């Protein structure tokens, strides 16, 4: 004859929780009219394959009700002493789900029954839990026993796109192959002693300039007769069968990249890297991406003093990377290998540098490597011939279960 809205709200909450369970699979099952405590039992599926692991779930819902100490993170809640004991002597773990219709919000928390009485006061958070597709491995982690002789859980959750270390390079229209003006080593000394601008856009292999630039001015045509200019399509040598042309084009690209730094990215020799340079003694900041997520300060150069006194300098750290200039099936690529460098008085190559490099390589997990490759991509993509691309993205099939592992990698 008359039915209040509270049971309606509860039934809606139970139905939406069941649908949220079903939209990830997991074969959620209902309950009879004789329920007491546990509101449902959920299996675990993996792409349609059952695994016979079950979790007990209790469902709570509200409409327009504000939770106790409602804020960004606090979200406290009070349980019942008489019901808890029902969840104490149980085989399956029991979880609690909270649902709100006003913001369409789902949350979950597992009740702890390790060795002592229950805390009775849940202090759940919104950054964690939140009952989305994430944190599905940490929910499924409560099926295996603590002993765990075998009996692992497959990585639930399907697909996540990753990237690769490689960079496409779009070549310019022409090069500037020239006539025979060969010099083994004096070709760098003539520009070294000259008073003109210094450039390293060339290599002497068989008597040719090998330049990307016009050999007309800027101290470039003092070694070769200016009448000899050649440029047709760059379809004869960069896409050519034999390997001598390939590994001389690699050196041409390396020299072209070496000239186009202008930040005094000094070239070492024992590791083939460009190891930065601070103009002034403090930390030298770098590119900020500003992709509407964070300011992303770089703090590249670091200064470290002695263990007890701040006067004398212990060491100064800089970032660097090594190129490779690889290729398959046209479209020459660049490979970036990030590396650290150590100086003593700013301009000093140091001589006990290996233990510091090994100790820092002991730290700096893969997230630092991904951030460094993103930084090095975004730093130099801001005259010509630097037509860099984006790191190619590949869609993997299995997501790494990072949710079930807490912290301290």
């Amino acid at each position: 004859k008359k039915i209040t809205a509270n049971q309606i709200i509860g039934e809606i909450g139970e139905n939406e929780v069941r649908g949220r369970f079903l939209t990830l699979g997991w074969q959620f099952d209902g309950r009879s009219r004789l329920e007491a405590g546990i509101d449902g039992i959920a299996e675990v599926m993996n792409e349609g394959q059952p695994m016979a692991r079950m979790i007990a779930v209790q469902i709570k819902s509200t409409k327009e009700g504000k939770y106790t100490s409602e804020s960004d993170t606090s979200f406290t809640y009070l349980l019942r002493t008489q019901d808890l004991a029902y969840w104490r002597g149980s085989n399956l773990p029991v979880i609690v789900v909270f649902y709100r219709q006003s913001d369409h919000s789902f949350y979950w928390k597992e009740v702890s029954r390790d060795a002592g009485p229950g805390e009775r006061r849940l202090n759940i958070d919104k950054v964690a839990d939140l009952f989305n597709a994430s944190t599905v491995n940490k929910l499924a982690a409560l099926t295996v026993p603590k002993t765990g002789l075998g009996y692992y859980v497959p990585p639930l959750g399907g697909g996540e796109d990753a990237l690769i270390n490689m960079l496409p390079l779009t070549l310019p229209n022409e090069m500037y192959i020239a006539s025979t003006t060969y010099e083994p080593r004096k070709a760098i000394a003539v520009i070294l002693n000259g008073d003109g601008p210094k450039r390293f856009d060339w290599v002497i292999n068989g008597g040719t300039f090998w330049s990307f630039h016009d050999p007309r001015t800027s101290a470039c045509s003092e070694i070769v007769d200016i009448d000899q200019v050649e440029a047709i399509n760059t379809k004869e040598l960069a896409l050519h069968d034999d390997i001598d042309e390939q590994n001389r084009f690699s050196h041409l690209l390396r020299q072209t990249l070496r000239y186009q730094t202008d930040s005094d990215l000094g070239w070492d020799k024992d590791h083939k890297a460009l190891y930065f340079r601070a103009i002034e003694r403090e930390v030298s900041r770098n590119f900020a991406y500003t992709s509407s997520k964070k300011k992303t300060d770089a703090n590249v150069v670091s200064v470290f003093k002695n263990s007890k006194d701040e006067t004398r300098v212990s060491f100064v750290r800089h970032h660097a990377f090594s190129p490779r200039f690889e290729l398959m099936a046209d479209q020459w690529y660049l490979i970036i290998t990030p590396t650290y460098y150590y100086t003593t008085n700013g301009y000093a190559p140091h001589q006990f540098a290996a233990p510091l490099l090994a100790g820092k390589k002991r730290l700096d997990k893969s997230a630092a490597l991904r951030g460094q490759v993103i930084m090095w991509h975004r730093f130099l993509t801001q005259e010509a011939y630097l037509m860099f691309g984006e790191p190619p993205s590949i869609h993997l099939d299995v997501r790494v279960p990072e949710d079930g592992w807490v912290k301290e990698k």
């Binding site: 603590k146 002993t147 765990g148 002789l149 075998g150 692992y152 497959p154 990585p155 996540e160 990753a162 990237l163 690769i164 270390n165 490689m166 490779r324 690889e326 398959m328 099936a329 490979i335 290998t337 390589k361 002991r362 700096d364 997990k365 893969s366 997230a367 490597l369 991904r370 490759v373 190619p392 993205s393 590949i394 869609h395 993997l396 099939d397 299995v398 790494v400 279960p401 990072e402 079930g404 592992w405 990698k409």
Partner: protein
């Protein structure tokens, strides 16, 4: 874009057809593949008069069973079930009295007071070999010997206060009837530490008491019994194959490079066959590339060794090498295979020095067993975040490897990559799952370190127990 695949962790066959992916749990759950007909494996100990009782105390200590120090990661640190009743080997290890020998302190000082580095190691290995040979021709013959070393010795043979001690002793012990095993003092006594040659103001570190015992007892059982503990599970109806692994090494007198090979196949019953050859293959210069005639002879020897057991020629031949397949060494193999009418062939180069990598947004690296087709080549991750140990064991980032097939191999790179991935957890020296190199490459590399000191006109055995 690029086409990517993720393979599952392959299974191993141990015990009564029981299958699993962890050697520890498989051995503890179903026993070894080939069981011992007898009941007792006898062990002899050679060394100082202090390390022998240490070995005995270790044996009666680990007989009852030790516990692992894992609470957060229990799959990574499982307990040792013992050596009786609940044993994972279904056998008992006994040290028979009269099979032990001790080295006097009178002659352990003359070793320590020799200015030259060569004759000290020579007299040490000569004394140990003489004691073992005297033990051989009698009624106290053991199944496997232990050469547990003291600390005062381990300041001349190792710290040198300069040839190798293991590669010479394992070469001088080739004519005996039993294999040998070398153990340092820290493994058997957990109260002493040994410095590490240079920067001696420190001490070397080892694993816990439960991680040592699994590897030590598995190696001892395989060396003493002679029956293999596990093997890779064969699939459904597939063509019969014979795997060959080829690697190189350097002689320890100069800069000459030599080559080594290893053979393996399946049996008519239930058992793996892994062995080497009773010959060396000369030098022919300094290059890390083999000639044509020796490759043809190797292929002929593998075919003959298969036909002696199976009475028929195989269907396919799989060859793995740590070098590029040159156009001269890829013709002798073809000729030797076409002299016998073998149809399916495969030739793969495994490269370990490659730069390209896959990066993720999290704090953990990619899964173990990731494959990306880089336009006719394969990038395989044989180490990574294994979702069975519960973490990624190690620091920094894993190292992938590249598979490059020859142009006369009739198989796609994905099938070859899966076959290479299935051949990793065959190492009987260790019971760990995070293994990077295939078994033929490891077996080809392990033979060379013992072949380095064999010499000219000596006995070379094809038994793998003399090398593992």
């Amino acid at each position: 874009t690029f086409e990517t695949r993720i393979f599952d962790e392959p299974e191993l066959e141990f015990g009564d057809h029981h299958h699993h992916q962890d050697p520890r749990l498989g051995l503890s759950e179903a026993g070894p593949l080939q069981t011992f007909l007898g009941d007792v494996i006898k062990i002899g100990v050679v060394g100082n008069s202090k390390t022998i009782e240490d070995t005995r105390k270790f044996i009666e200590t680990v007989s009852s069973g030790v516990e692992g120090k894992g609470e957060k990661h229990p799959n990574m640190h499982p307990p040792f079930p013992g050596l009786g009743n609940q044993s994972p080997y279904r056998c008992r290890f006994e040290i028979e009295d009269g099979a032990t020998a001790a080295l006097t302190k009178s002659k352990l000082d003359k070793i320590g007071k020799e200015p030259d580095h060569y004759r000290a190691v020579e007299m040490a290995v000569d004394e140990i070999i003489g004691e073992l040979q005297a033990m051989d021709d009698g009624g106290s013959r053991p199944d496997v010997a232990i050469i547990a070393l003291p600390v005062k010795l381990l300041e001349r043979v190792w710290n040198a206060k300069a040839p190798n001690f293991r590669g010479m002793l394992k070469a001088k012990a080739m004519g005996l009837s039993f294999p040998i095993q070398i153990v340092w003092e820290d493994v058997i006594d957990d109260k002493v530490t040994i410095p590490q040659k240079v920067k001696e103001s420190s001490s070397r570190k080892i694993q816990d008491i439960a991680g040592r015992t699994w590897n030590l007892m598995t190696s001892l059982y395989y060396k003493g019994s002679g029956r293999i503990p596990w093997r890779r599970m064969p699939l459904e109806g597939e063509f019969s194959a014979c795997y060959v692994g080829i690697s190189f090494y350097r002689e320890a007198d100069g800069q000459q490079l030599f080559t080594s090979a290893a053979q393996m196949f399946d049996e008519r019953g239930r058992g793996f066959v892994l062995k080497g050859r009773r010959a060396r293959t000369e030098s022919r210069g300094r290059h890390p590339y083999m000639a044509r005639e020796d490759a043809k002879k190797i292929i002929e020897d593998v075919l003959a060794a298969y036909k002696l057991h199976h009475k028929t020629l195989p269907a396919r031949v799989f060859i793995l090498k740590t070098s590029r397949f040159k156009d001269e060494e890829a013709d002798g193999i073809i000729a030797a295979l076409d002299e016998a009418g073998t149809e399916l062939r495969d030739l793969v180069w495994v490269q370990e020095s490659y730069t390209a990598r896959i990066l993720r947004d999290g704090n953990y690296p990619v899964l173990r067993g990731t494959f990306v087709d880089l336009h006719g080549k394969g990038l395989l991750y044989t180490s990574g975040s294994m979702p069975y140990y519960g973490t990624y064991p190690g620091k920094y980032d894993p190292n992938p490897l590249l598979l490059c097939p020859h142009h006369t191999s009739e198989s796609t790179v994905a099938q070859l990559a899966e076959e290479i991935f299935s051949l990793t957890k065959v190492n009987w020296n260790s019971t760990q799952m995070n293994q990077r190199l295939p078994i033929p490459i490891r077996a080809a590399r392990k033979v060379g370190e013992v072949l380095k000191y064999v010499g000219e006109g000596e006995v070379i055995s094809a038994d793998y127990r003399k090398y593992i």
